[PDB]
Design a protein around this ligand. Structure first.
Ligand SMILES: COc1c(Cl)cccc1Nc1c(-c2ccncc2OC[C@@H]2CCCO2)[nH]c2c1C(=O)NCC2
Length: 300
């Protein structure tokens, strides 16, 4: 694990992008020393130990890396410790699905599911439990390419360890598996539960899970056998994937390797698996196009 220290004087045009539970994220241009290459970058800050643990996890999983997992370029030491990554120009996938709903087709939704399952399979191979998978922590590099971000709650499992036992710190109940809510146990299979909630958010075009329901009632709702509803665009095969992700027995949930396969099978005939009105006449910018340059957490 190697952390690059990118000089403060090397960054220009730093401007705010947004704020929330993740802290503050800005956009800027990193001009590396001794070379002329103005790189669009995203800068995050918030507790300076919590942001350094995020950097360690990200650097530990950098080699070989994955196209669908955010890569840490380096860190910067200004008044606070800042994280630096390649800027994802289209922003957060949760805001992207809400803004571009009337132009997102079935091919895009099923490919995003494939790409998130690919990045999660890579993280599982590196013994990394993300613990915060949600549409808010999936970014859009191009409309056709998404990346998993935010390793604030992510934990590397020890060689012998199969699970992480968390402290009383704030965690996202409505995205968490039932064993994480009751016993604070986090595994790659608990991430499969959160992956299913992320898919439900994409399929509903950014709806809030368990909207209006308090988080203190979720364990009870889940123990009664109740789950997030069938999104209107989902055929039964897509919804059964989400429902297999939210099974009580963690081992019975699909594996990220199986989700890559099942959603890739769906992406080969996307209009069979998702019924979207006006799907054949929907378009989003692509780097292939000549005009591409124009374009929650609670105390347990
Ligand atoms: C953890 O990876 C990062 C690093 Cl190392 C540095 C800067 C940002 C991020 N990621 C994030 C971006 C981000 C990364 C790349 N390009 C643009 C970005 O912001 C897009 C919009 C702006 C406001 C919310 O997201 N946006 C978010 C994270 C995050 O960790 N949590 C949720 C919000």
């Amino acid at each position: 694990a190697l952390l690059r220290i990118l000089k403060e004087t090397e960054f220009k045009k730093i401007k705010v992008l947004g704020s929330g539970a993740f802290g503050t994220v800005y956009k800027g241009l990193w001009i590396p020393e001794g070379e002329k290459v103005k790189i669009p970058v995203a800068i995050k800050e918030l507790a300076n130990k919590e942001i350094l643990d995020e950097a360690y996890v990200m650097a530990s999983v950098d080699n070989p890396g994955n196209p669908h997992v955010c890569r840490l370029l380096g860190i910067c030491l200004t008044s606070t410790v800042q994280l630096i990554t390649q800027l994802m120009p289209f922003g957060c996938l949760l805001d992207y699905v809400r803004e571009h709903k009337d132009n997102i087709g079935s091919q895009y939704l099923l490919n995003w599911c494939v790409q998130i399952a690919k990045g999660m399979n890579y993280l599982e191979d590196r013994r990394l439990v993300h613990r915060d998978l949600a549409a808010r922590n999936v970014l859009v590099k191009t409309p056709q390419h998404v990346k998993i971000t935010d390793f604030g709650l992510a934990k590397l499992l020890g060689a012998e360890e199969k699970e992480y036992h968390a402290e009383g710190g704030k965690v996202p109940i409505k995205w968490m598996a039932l064993e994480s809510i009751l016993h604070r146990i986090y595994t790659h299979q608990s991430d499969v539960w959160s992956y299913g909630v992320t898919v439900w958010e994409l399929m509903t075009f950014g709806s809030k899970p368990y909207d209006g329901i308090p988080a203190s009632e979720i364990s009870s709702i889940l123990e009664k056998g109740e789950r997030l509803p069938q999104p209107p665009i989902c055929t039964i095969d897509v919804y059964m994937i989400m429902r297999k992700c939210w099974m009580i027995d963690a081992d019975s949930r699909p594996k990220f390797r199986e989700l890559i396969i099942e959603f890739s099978k769906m992406a080969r005939d996307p209009q069979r698996y998702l019924v979207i009105q006006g799907d054949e006449r929907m378009h989003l910018p692509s780097p292939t196009d000549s005009n591409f340059y124009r374009a929650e957490y609670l105390i347990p």
